[PDB]
Amino acid sequence: GRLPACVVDCGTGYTKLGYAGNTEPQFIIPSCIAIKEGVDDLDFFIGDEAIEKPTYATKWPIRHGIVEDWDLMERFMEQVIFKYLRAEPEDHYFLLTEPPLNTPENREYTAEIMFESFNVPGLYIAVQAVLALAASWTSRQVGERTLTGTVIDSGDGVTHVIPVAEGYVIGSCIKHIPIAGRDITYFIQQLLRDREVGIPPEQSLETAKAVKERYSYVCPDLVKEFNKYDTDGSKWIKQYTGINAISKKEFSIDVGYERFLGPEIFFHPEFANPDFTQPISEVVDEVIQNCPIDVRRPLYKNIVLSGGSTMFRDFGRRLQRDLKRTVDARLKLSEELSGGRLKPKPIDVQVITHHMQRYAVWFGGSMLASTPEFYQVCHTKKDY
């Protein structure tokens, strides 16, 4: 441990960089590369210096949780290592992150880019589920620490539900909900471009993202909230002030019914996707009840949340209430099927929220890589 390990997590919308043993990432940047379209190969910019730049074509080399172009990911990693982290790759261990359901070809090309081009002494590619579940222990009681749970991996691409039992991932029972944050901001944009005038066309996405991040929450029932909005408008209606890109003319808009119809499309995907109609309360149940029969109870007792799109207020409460409602009826049916002589034990359903929820994968990577025995796990240079 003469120098700490490096942790880099690559995503569809953001990339997180840092050193092992720290609680927070040192850099959360967008995953954008901008180039110009000799030594013209190195004339490029990454991250916040690539969102707007006049004479430079920008693009995104990660889409849907897979790599589309590798010539761009190589350069992205060069300027991750040599500009921001400022680490020589010849004397640091690396802990990268793979998407769920990754091919061996995609896993091996990363090792090629690392070993053959950077002389990395050691590399470790880790699944996201166990690292997400490891971070759950920071805000849990001392008497309960296990590697058994179900992770609802949300974010910017597609939402996964992955169960893990005793340290390993059960590959068959992984299911995808195609809803994520990008769909939520696309939905709230269409809501806002029907009622309010004063939004320039260029800054529509930025205003939608700001309204999503600042004011947004979930409600038990929709009709009561709609009634409360009209009955008493002063309490539940706020104003948002923005700065124009041209001539600095300030503008104002009112936030109304788009506050709590934004994160509702998790629980009612037919509002915004016509080809999918199954609420998330049922996908978790159907994934849990397709597993081995001896590990059904511990998975319900530990349903952790990892990802930025689970950051809304009272998100876990709806999952808890719906899952309790849909398991109680099933136990009632089973009890009535066998008369009334014996009452089964009610299943305890629980969802755990933490302070560390936006960057849980990076935190798990930092905790795993700080242990002394981590250096006995990685693949060395001679193995390749």
Binding site: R195, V223, F226, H268, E270, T277
Partner: protein, 174 residues
Amino acid sequence: PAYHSSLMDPDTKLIGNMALLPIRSQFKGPAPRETKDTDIVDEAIYYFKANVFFKNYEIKNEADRTLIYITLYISECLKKLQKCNSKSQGEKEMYTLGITNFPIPGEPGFPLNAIYAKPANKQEDEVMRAYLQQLRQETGLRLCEKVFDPQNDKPSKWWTCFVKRQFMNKSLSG
């Protein structure tokens, strides 16, 4: 998930498959009259703002066929009552809107007719045409108070944004 019917009396009637409930009426109409105030009109409009987004909807009850009709007509009423300014002129426009021979279920031109009962009898047609017209006229008085604002007498922007939506992706006006 979807908000199904309400107020199903055991002793009702099922001409076609509608459900005749007491309605607080003041224009005209042969019907049983109402002793209370919570008619199906004020109940249906209370449920309106959450139902427009639902693309699939189960036919739980007979009187649910009342909710599929009012909620589908208020969409057209909001669509028409957009460019008017005065509350009185808008009220006159909704009053004249009720005087129109829309196609009832049972004839071509009525969409979403697969979930309806055909009045082949000689007697059901006139009562259905009378009552659906009466209901479409009666909705206007209670919609007038809420479409416009009482402070400045323009259509409120909150109401005039569920204008492009169609309940179950199929509106009355084809």
